[PDB]
Paper text:
Mcl-1 has attracted attention because of its established role in preventing cell death by binding and sequestering pro-apoptotic BH3 proteins, thereby mediating cancer cell survival, as well as intrinsic and acquired resistance against cytotoxic and some targeted therapies, including venetoclax.
One avenue began with analysis of a series of indole-2-carboxylic acids which have been reported by others. Investigating one such literature compound, 1, we were able to obtain a co-crystal structure in complex with Mcl-1. Surprisingly, we observed two inhibitors bound to the BH3-binding domain of Mcl-1. The first high-affinity binding (cyan molecule in Fig. 1a) overlays well with reported crystal structures, with the 2-carboxylic acid forming an ionic interaction with Arg263 of Mcl-1 (dotted line) and the naphthyl group occupying an induced-fit pocket. To our knowledge, this 2:1 stoichiometry has not been observed previously with this series of compounds and results in a conformational change in Mcl-1 protein residues (e.g., Met231 side chain and larger movement in the Leu246 to Asp256 helix) to enlarge the binding pocket and accommodate the second binding molecule. Since this larger pocket may be more druggable, we hypothesized that a new hybrid molecule able to take advantage of both binding events would have vastly improved potency compared to 1 or 2 (Mcl-1 TR-FRET IC50s = 1.1 and 0.29 µM, respectively).
Residue numbers in the entry: 172 to 195, 198 to 325
Write the structure that this text describes.
């Protein structure tokens, strides 16, 4: 599965470099993956700053203490992503909260749960939104959407 293997890479690398504080060198320059991670860094870091309150509140509410609580995250994700509208905004918000949660997993000494968490995000993202992802040219459409430079 090309669109899954790709999503899992962008989602895995973002959550990892966010939790660590330093960038790992993803794919190849100019490709969908490279541009998608650079975009996700730009728009997603903003989402975590702008929505820090709501993110602190959802994290407390979710009360993720261990590995079990990480695995059980697929349930609330399925609930939320099977509802409302589909747009890249929601997709970037979903990945930004996963980077926020991944930072917490580090502070609570559950670093190992991060890649499993990333896996769970890709699984929910594809099972609830793949027809829309295909129709949108996947990570190429994502990149194109947040490309605001050639409008004039
Ligand atoms: C504030 C909001 C505005 C717009 C877009 C998104 C969000 C939003 C963000 C994050 C989570 C939620 C939730 C779920 C609340 C926690 O629910 C659970 C917790 C643990 C297990 C389970 C669940 C529910 C399913 C069963 C298993 C709802 C919601 O219910 O409307 N909205 C959310
Ligand atoms: C911004 C915002 C404003 C006001 C009040 C609340 C919020 C809010 C808080 C937290 C997440 C979201 C999301 C992402 C979709 C739900 O994602 C999750 C739900 C449960 C667990 C996990 C996720 C993502 C991966 C980590 C594990 C949306 C959104 O799509 O509009 N809004 C959220």
């Amino acid at each position: 599965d090309d669109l899954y293997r790709q999503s899992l890479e962008i989602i895995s690398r973002y959550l990892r470099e966010q939790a660590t504080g330093s960038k790992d060198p993803l794919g190849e320059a100019g490709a969908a993956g490279r541009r998608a991670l650079e975009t996700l860094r730009r728009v997603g870091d903003g989402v975590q700053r702008n929505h820090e309150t709501a993110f602190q509140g959802m994290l407390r509410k979710l009360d993720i203490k261990n590995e079990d609580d990480v695995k059980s995250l697929s349930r609330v994700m399925i609930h939320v992503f099977s509802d409302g509208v589909t747009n890249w905004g929601r997709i970037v918000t979903l990945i930004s909260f996963g980077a926020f949660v991944a930072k917490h997993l580090k502070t609570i000494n559950q670093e190992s749960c991060i890649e499993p968490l990333a896996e769970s995000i890709t699984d929910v993202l594809v099972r609830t939104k793949r027809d829309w992802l295909v129709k949108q040219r996947g990570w190429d459409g994502f990149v194109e959407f947040f490309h605001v430079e050639d409008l004039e």
